[PDB]
Design a protein around this nucleic acid. Structure first.
Ligand SMILES: Cc1cc2nc3c(=O)[nH]c(=O)nc-3n(C[C@H](O)[C@H](O)[C@H](O)COP(=O)(O)OP(=O)(O)OC[C@H]3O[C@@H](n4cnc5c(N)ncnc54)[C@H](O)[C@@H]3O)c2cc1C
Length: 501
DNA sequence: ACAGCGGTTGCAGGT
DNA sequence: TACCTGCAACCGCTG
């Protein structure tokens, strides 16, 4: 027999996976002719690379285990092949006698050059390759082409384009494999029968002391359970307005589907389809940009602008990005990174992020504004790096785009609007329950100064069990001064950019 | 040409 | 409640 291979990278699901389904229907169309190998390639070198935190490793570990469990139900399994694609594919193309390889496409620069190299190797070896665009509802290439060769840079124009595009069929889970014995062992499997088994926690998480509570388990099964639980309250879904959801509710005010959508545990096209069905049923409903469907479209929007710019994740060489003379400040960056800025709202958020790997969108706004244009005047690239480490939903395009938005570098330009690290959280948490949870050293402070503890006398600090400078830091900057100076810096940078433009 | 419009998610003070 | 203003004036899109 010859081998059909599906290569999982994102798209870590069985549902709505045309690349995977193509392999399974091809096998059942010619029973006895093929072996099927669903694979994930794991480079064991990067397990101690600092840009992937322990919480995201755990999520991947859990996702891979779920994916194996689901493939087992189809008379298959997951093969987790350790190595780099450049060495792995030449070996397995030969040893498995591979006839066809499928995978879901990705727009990220690294994957573009990785996949081009894979396709070059395949054509040399006479392996067929079939790729599918299913990570996004709309194909960025088609959006850009429909918009005369340019990515739309405003949301309303983007919507106007995608309304003209067709949405492919959402697929179910593939068919069970018929007449599919286990493939014969290759050289690697002959030495170690467990060589391609799912990695353990010990194998994947090198820094387990960095793990926090497992609030958001990995995998497609959890993705679908979580979505279905979200979709149950159709009134909540239909009337959803992002701006009215709280950043500092102890329980998430939004769906927390982002990690599942990032990994492909949940199909964005399926989620889109389910929401459309609800909106048809609910006469009173919100519209984009603020609706739940609108949030999915924001994801589509950023994927499209990112697709057209390999430098999307930096300032220099990035066609969208305002050139702003951000400053280096190691100490302030470290304080922000570790939630020791001395603004309890900011610190609470940065601590929740590190511990749990998800923070609400407007919490992201608050800390990202603070780091960049609002207060510290540090580049959004530094914030991006920290988020990249700590977020379960770390997404190249989404992280870059939203960091440019919040820094008023691209897409958003009204830099006069500046979040207050003192006032913003009060609207939705006047008692400061969120701060009391994530900055417990301040948990006895009255609500009157818990957002602004510098207003407390020394005798009051002592009475509250937390003395500033000892038990919680002094504030690293004075918001009321620096944000006004930074508005002027922003205006000056915009002028310089206009002049070049 | 350039003025006017709308832009997911500002704050403070006011009704 | 949910909206109003002044603050000071940005960008891309439109005609
Ligand atoms: C500084 C900054 C960095 C960010 N980095 C990431 C990131 O790396 N990965 C990521 O997925 N999101 C990122 N976001 C966007 C957004 O905050 C998250 O997607 C959102 O908080 C996810 O929570 P949710 O699933 O409950 O969202 P919901 O409100 O329930 O929305 C559902 C889905 O829509 C999409 N979505 C929602 N908001 C946005 C948005 N503003 N931009 C693009 N897509 C959106 C997500 O896929 C999300 O899961 C970032 C935002 C900011 C301000």
């Amino acid at each position: 027999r010859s081998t059909l291979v599906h290569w999982f990278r994102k798209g870590l699901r069985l549902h709505d996976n045309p690349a995977l389904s193509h392999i399974f229907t091809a096998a059942n169309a010619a029973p006895g002719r093929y072996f099927v190998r669903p694979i994930f390639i794991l480079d064991p070198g990067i397990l101690d690379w600092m840009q992937v935190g322990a919480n995201r490793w755990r999520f991947l570990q859990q996702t891979l285990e779920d994916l194996d469990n689901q493939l087992r139900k189809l008379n298959s399994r997951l093969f987790v092949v350790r190595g780099k694609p450049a060495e792995v594919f030449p070996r397995i193309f030969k040893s498995w006698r591979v006839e066809m390889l499928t995978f879901e496409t990705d727009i990220e620069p690294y994957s573009v050059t990785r996949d081009a190299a894979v396709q070059k190797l395949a054509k040399a070896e006479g392996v067929r390759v079939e790729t599918h665009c299913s990570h996004t509802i709309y194909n960025p290439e088609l959006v850009i082409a429909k918009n005369l060769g340019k990515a739309p840079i405003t949301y309303q124009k983007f919507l106007g384009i995608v309304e003209q595009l067709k949405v492919p069929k959402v697929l179910g889970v593939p068919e069970k494999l018929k007449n599919m014995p286990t493939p014969p062992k290759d050289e690697v499997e002959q030495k170690d029968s467990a060589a391609y088994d799912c990695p353990t926690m010990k194998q994947l998480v090198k820094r387990p002391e960095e793990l926090g509570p497992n609030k958001f388990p990995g995998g497609e099964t959890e993705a679908l359970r979580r979505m279905e639980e979200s979709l149950k309250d159709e009134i909540w879904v239909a009337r959803f307005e992002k701006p009215n959801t709280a950043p500092n509710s102890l329980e998430p005010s939004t769906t927390v589907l982002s990690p599942y959508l990032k990994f492909g545990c949940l199909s964005a096209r399926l989620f889109n389809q389910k929401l459309k069905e609800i909106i048809k049923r609910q006469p009173k409903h919100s519209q984009p940009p603020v609706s739940l469907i609108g949030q999915l479209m924001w994801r589509e929007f950023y994927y499209t602008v990112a697709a057209a710019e390999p430098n999307f994740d930096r300032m220099l060489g990035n066609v969208y990005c305002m050139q702003i003379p951000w400053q280096e400040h190691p100490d302030h960056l470290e304080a922000w990174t570790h939630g020791r800025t001395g603004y309890p709202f900011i610190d609470a958020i940065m601590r929740q992020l590190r511990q749990e790997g998800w923070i609400h969108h407007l919490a992201r706004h608050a800390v990202a504004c603070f780091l960049t244009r609002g207060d510290l005047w540090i580049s959004w690239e530094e914030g991006q790096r920290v988020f990249e480490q700590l977020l379960l939903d770390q997404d190249w395009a989404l992280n870059a785009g939203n960091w440019m938005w919040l820094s008023a570098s691209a897409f958003f330009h009204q830099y006069f609007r500046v979040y207050s690290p003192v006032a913003f959280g009060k609207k939705t948490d006047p008692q400061g329950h969120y701060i009391r949870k994530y900055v417990p050293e301040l948990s006895k402070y009255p609500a009157g100064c818990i957002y602004e503890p510098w207003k407390a006398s020394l005798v009051d600090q002592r009475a509250y069990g937390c003395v500033l400078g000892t038990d919680y830091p002094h504030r690293i900057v004075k918001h009321e001064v620096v944000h006004k100076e930074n508005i002027k810096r922003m205006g000056a940078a915009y002028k310089v950019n206009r002049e070049v433009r």
